[PDB]
Design a protein around this ligand. Structure first.
Ligand code: MG
Ligand code: MG
Ligand code: MG
Lengths: 88, 101, 70, 119
RNA sequence: UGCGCAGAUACCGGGAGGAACGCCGAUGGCGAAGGCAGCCACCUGGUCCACCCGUGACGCUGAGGCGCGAAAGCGUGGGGAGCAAACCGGAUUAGAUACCCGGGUAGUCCACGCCCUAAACGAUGCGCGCUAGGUCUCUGGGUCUCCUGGGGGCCGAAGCUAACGCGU
């Protein structure tokens, strides 16, 4: 799983201001968490395809989110992908 | 690390030497895998509804217990290395859904 | 006649040990009784089938019996 | 040859032959009979008469060992069934209890295509 | 046909091994499809509701691309209980390369890799907004006769349709 605290830590390390749960940045972050967990489970459980569709969706939701950010504030985009290491 | 329930059914033909020898080895595994221990229960000698390992009765240990979850399969694998251990059944502890009221 | 829930008082039907209760939800062939006879809800009836099956593995309830007088 | 006082009559009904065997209280065969073991041969061994006859005849052979009472255990469906029971009951040889005990898998091997006409 | 006096069938005890999980079981449930059914644990996907807290149009569809895709089939290596194309026999028939009976290889199962098709069916692409109701049902929530969601069925206003039908 992803225990409530682990999640909570990430919302914290990413929220634009205190009380920020659902901004582009927190959202991208959380997906990235889910993805890396889900990807570790996939390098082992290669034949679990139903789960793998979940991935494709998360990877999309992410690119679609990031696409928006790069179009509004190309700045905190560059910062966010650096703080995570992605896309480029 | 979550809460569980380890049931063991044992050989119903033991004197206190054999009996508590097994009961100790158990406490070792339990301990040697991360288990702390809330309640114990020992109804012991009960008649099974069909004979397990040739034998119309069984000795019942039940433990509620908390432990590292990624080891609970390992624990139980070791619990039945023994021969006087006949059934080992481990189960996620649970809210007790009731009925009639 | 009676539904097996109409009989009892309150009980934990997540409790795979209480054979004194759980034993009443079986036929004389020790088969899990249908809803129409258990008087239970779809949801309860689901939970029970589970508890009954767990009992069977511990040795406390039967998988089968034989019909007496046919 | 020992005297048994009581024990088991096993009836094995089928849509092709009824067969009956009698045993001591640990299930060891004393005597036995079947449709073919009386005269009938081919498709008559199923008929409730064939069943009755076989049944009765087995009981007579057991009564030779002085058999006085039995628990009946019946297995399978077929024409001779209630008739082989009705027989043992009316053979003198006293019927203590009855019990169906037909095998049934909890979904085991693939049945032969004849038996999945219920496909 | 076959099997059986090298003692079968039927019965009691013990063991070995493979496949599939009775009752629960539904008009049920989950999944995008194909599809998913003993019980336990771990790892993991989707989804619904309530609160109305956060972002602030970040949306819909989607040629090509990629991935999934029942069954049968193919390659290598296992496994093999029951069932069974082909095949070998017994029947039936005017004949019977069939339907019925006795056997039986591939295959069905597991590992890894291919194939990529179907009455792959709701024969109904995906999304959104609008337009009477009644009834049964799964799963939520509330102030729990009932109300408010989300799913599953039937009947049917308006309207539609060659018709049969469809009809929140
Ligand atoms: Mg295949
Ligand atoms: Mg092959
Ligand atoms: Mg054949």
């Amino acid at each position: 799983p992803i225990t409530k605290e682990e999640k909570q830590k990430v919302i914290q390390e990413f929220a634009r201001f205190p009380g920020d749960t659902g901004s582009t940045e927190v959202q991208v972050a959380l997906l990235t968490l889910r993805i890396n967990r889900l990807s570790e489970h996939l390098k082992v459980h290669k034949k679990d395809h139903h789960s793998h569709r979940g991935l494709l969706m998360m990877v999309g939701q992410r690119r679609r989110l990031l696409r928006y950010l790069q179009r509004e504030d190309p700045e905190r985009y560059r910062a966010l992908i650096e703080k995570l290491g992605i896309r480029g | 690390m979550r809460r569980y329930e380890v049931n063991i059914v044992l050989n119903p033909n033991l004197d206190q030497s054999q009996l508590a020898l097994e009961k100790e080895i158990i406490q070792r595994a339990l301990e040697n895998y991360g288990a702390r221990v809330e309640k114990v229960e020992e109804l012991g000698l009960r008649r099974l509804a069909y004979p397990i390992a040739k034998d119309p009765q069984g000795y019942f240990l039940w433990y509620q217990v908390e432990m590292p979850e990624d080891r609970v399969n390992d624990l139980a694998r070791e619990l039945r290395i023994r021969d006087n251990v006949r059934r080992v059944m481990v189960v996620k502890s649970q809210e007790p859904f009731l009925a009639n009221a | 006649k009676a539904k097996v829930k109409a009989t009892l008082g309150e009980f934990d039907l997540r409790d795979y040990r209480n054979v004194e209760v759980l034993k009443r939800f079986l036929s004389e062939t020790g088969k899990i009784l249908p809803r129409r006879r258990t008087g239970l809800s779809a949801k309860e009836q689901r939970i029970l089938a589970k508890t009954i099956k767990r009992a069977r593995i511990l040795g406390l309830l039967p998988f089968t019996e034989k019909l007496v007088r046919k | 040859k020992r005297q048994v006082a009581s024990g088991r009559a096993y009836i094995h009904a089928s849509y092709n032959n009824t067969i009956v065997t009698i045993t001591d209280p640990d299930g060891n065969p004393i005597t036995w009979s079947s449709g073919g073991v009386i005269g009938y041969k081919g498709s008559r061994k199923g008929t409730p008469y064939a069943a009755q006859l076989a049944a009765l005849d087995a009981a007579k052979k057991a009564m030779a060992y002085g058999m006085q009472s039995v628990d009946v255990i019946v297995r399978g469906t077929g024409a001779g069934r209630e008739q082989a029971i009705r027989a043992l009951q009316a053979s003198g040889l006293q019927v203590k209890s009855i019990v169906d005990d037909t095998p049934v898998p909890h979904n085991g091997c693939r049945p032969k295509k004849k038996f999945r006409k219920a496909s």
